[PDB]
């Protein structure tokens, strides 16, 4: 609860006192697709 209060303080009112591609790439990808891996 106190941390939630910390959040509500920090969001607004954080003051005033709070009482604290590549050919090769494409072909190898196709190769892996054929592999399935």
């Amino acid at each position: 609860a106190y941390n939630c209060a910390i959040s509500v303080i920090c969001c607004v009112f954080n003051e005033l006192k709070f009482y604290q591609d590549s050919t090769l790439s494409e072909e190898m990808s196709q190769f892996d697709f054929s592999t399935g891996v």
Partner: protein, 44 residues
């Protein structure tokens, strides 16, 4: 709510000291003219 407002508005003659004059009428002219945090911050 019934205060020196009425005194001044009717004591337009005398509301302060009157010895002879001067400082007397000068005086006449001088007067004649948690929960706390809740209240201050939650609704301010």
């Amino acid at each position: 709510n019934h205060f020196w407002e009425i005194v001044v508005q009717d004591g337009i003659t005398l509301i302060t000291k009157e010895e002879a004059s001067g400082s007397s009428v000068t005086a006449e002219e001088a007067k004649k003219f948690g929960g706390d945090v809740d209240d201050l911050l939650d609704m301010i």
